[PDB]
Design a protein around this nucleic acid. Sequence first.
RNA 1: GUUUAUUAAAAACACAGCACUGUGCAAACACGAAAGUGGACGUAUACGGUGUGACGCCUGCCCGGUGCCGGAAGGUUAAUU
Lengths: 100, 149, 271, 77, 55
Amino acid sequence: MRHYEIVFMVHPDQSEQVPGMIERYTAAITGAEGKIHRLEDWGRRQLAYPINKLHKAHYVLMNVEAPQEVIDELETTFRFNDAVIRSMVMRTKHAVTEAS
Amino acid sequence: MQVILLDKVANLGSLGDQVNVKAGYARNFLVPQGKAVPATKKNIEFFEARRAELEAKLAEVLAAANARAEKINALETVTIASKAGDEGKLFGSIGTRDIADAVTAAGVEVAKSEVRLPNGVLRTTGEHEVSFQVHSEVFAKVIVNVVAE
Amino acid sequence: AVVKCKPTSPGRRHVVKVVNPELHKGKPFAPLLEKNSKSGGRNNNGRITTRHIGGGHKQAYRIVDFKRNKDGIPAVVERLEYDPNRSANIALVLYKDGERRYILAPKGLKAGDQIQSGVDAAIKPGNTLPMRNIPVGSTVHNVEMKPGKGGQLARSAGTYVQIVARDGAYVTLRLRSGEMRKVEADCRATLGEVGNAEHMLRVLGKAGAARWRGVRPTVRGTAMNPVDHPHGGGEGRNFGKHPVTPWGVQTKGKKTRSNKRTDKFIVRRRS
Amino acid sequence: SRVCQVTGKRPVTGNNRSHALNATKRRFLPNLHSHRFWVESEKRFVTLRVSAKGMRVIDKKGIDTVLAELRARGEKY
Amino acid sequence: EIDYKDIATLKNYITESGKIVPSRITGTRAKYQRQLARAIKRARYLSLLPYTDRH
RNA sequence: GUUUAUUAAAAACACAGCACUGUGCAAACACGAAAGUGGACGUAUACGGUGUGACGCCUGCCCGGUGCCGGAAGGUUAAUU
Ligand SMILES: [Mg+2]
Ligand SMILES: [Mg+2]
Ligand SMILES: [Mg+2]
Ligand SMILES: [Mg+2]
Ligand SMILES: [Mg+2]
Ligand SMILES: [Mg+2]
Ligand SMILES: [Mg+2]
Ligand SMILES: [Mg+2]
């Protein structure tokens, strides 16, 4: 039941599926009484360094508040989803909704 | 081996020619198929009497295939269903038999052995292009899309 | 667990046992059993084909599902039970449709765990999926050499196979022996290691222990006479020969594999 | 039964001679192979144990004529 | 307080080769430098900033 | 514990343990002109071969010779032509 900050980059060829993934991921948390405090689609951006012979990735922001299990069980889905590469999660003490 | 061609072959020669080939090529491919027959005096005389109609008949076979190719080409879209996962990734696969049945279902009878899938086996959702070989000198093309819920 | 016996007598001082309290204490599942008889190393000609085999405790074979073709039907692990026919244990699973089967027990499996087989199954230990759908770098066991033929790799107590690369229609596997092999992506594999990893820590402790499991004594070639073994005899302990097998083939270094059929799939040898 | 079904070739016994002319008995056996020939008349493939020489005989005489002899000898195929 | 996503300000505290400028030069307070470094390392992981000029 | 049934029961053989080495499964290997069979309805924590022989402290130096393993540019070299 803590505040979390989630960032994940997907394959540029899958830029047409990002709206779908956001809905599915958001649905999973909201089903466990969680709520999303911030959502931002940063668009395709230039990578500082290549990853897996790839130079452009689609960036999004997701700050959420949900229980331990739903993020823990959400991490495992992040692992085997080949579309998403190099996702990160963070711990926060207070919900933040800024443009950034 | 010396053989008599009953049909146009891609590189070996044309109909009715007398060109020698490897024994294995004729024994295992040409003879079991209708492409050619062994070159002996017995068949040569039989060929001459049969020569006129074979050339005429082979023209109708590719004509129907060309006509059937246009009929196949008329159905520009075919829809199939399969086990589709997240982000459109299908757990299973769409084989040549699956695409074959779809075209005949409320469509045109197409054999399972004439479907061509050069790009793979169509393991991803969306719409892709598939080619058929109705006859050795004709081609057919159509867009195929797979979707499921 | 591993327990060292107290030295209450010779032949018991050095005995180390592997005790698993989770194993079923009762009789096995009768309808899934069948009779297998000991051969003693004799072939259909009656000649001793392989040596140092004979005797031992009677054993009853149990049909272990090495294919796992029940797709889309979840099953629950009823219990783990001892298997005399192999080093690993076997977990009895109950598909919710009412069918029971035996499978090799993975590393962490226990009674009541959820296991599912299929192409859409979850990525959990005990689940069987084609390596096409299995993420690369994941540890798997009971891998089939051919699609639909049943698993043939990583079946021992603590063995496992690592999926290192996936190129097109073939997946390269790091076998337990260290050799890298190529297999079709359509072949199925079971996630997770094989259970009972402590099978290598047991010590038989006494000669009779080996006899209980059908291993007859091995006689050295040095103690032989020249007529029986190339190592032969000699007054005293004389060897003066390059070590060889009892049929004259040089041992201790000589390569022996001569299978030109499947060397295409062997990307790299074990060493 | 390492016998060709067409030409009837069967293993024959001879001896191999070394430089010192020592004679050790040996066997010469034919180049039998399992091959299937289509019968243009019966629309079916027929498989018989034939040697390399026998295949050439079928190539020259033709499969249809060859099977006629086997029927005469009563050999089943 | 310092946010790794605040990417516009990060070049003010890194060199061309990706070096993190020491506090003795930038004059930043010790407490802020510690969190600043965490932000920089965090951004580098996400490919937002480069580890070095060679890639 | 085993052994020269009928002059040798032992320090010999075996032994748990240890090490080297072979074997990716139609496994190596072994009995078979072959089919096939065992190894094994086992799958490298498995199996075969070899040496040593519980356990304790240990197991040093030498690859010229012989064997094995790897490479092989070059020299030499069979049938065939
Ligand atoms: Mg043995
Ligand atoms: Mg031994
Ligand atoms: Mg002796
Ligand atoms: Mg001496
Ligand atoms: Mg005596
Ligand atoms: Mg006595
Ligand atoms: Mg000794
Ligand atoms: Mg030494």
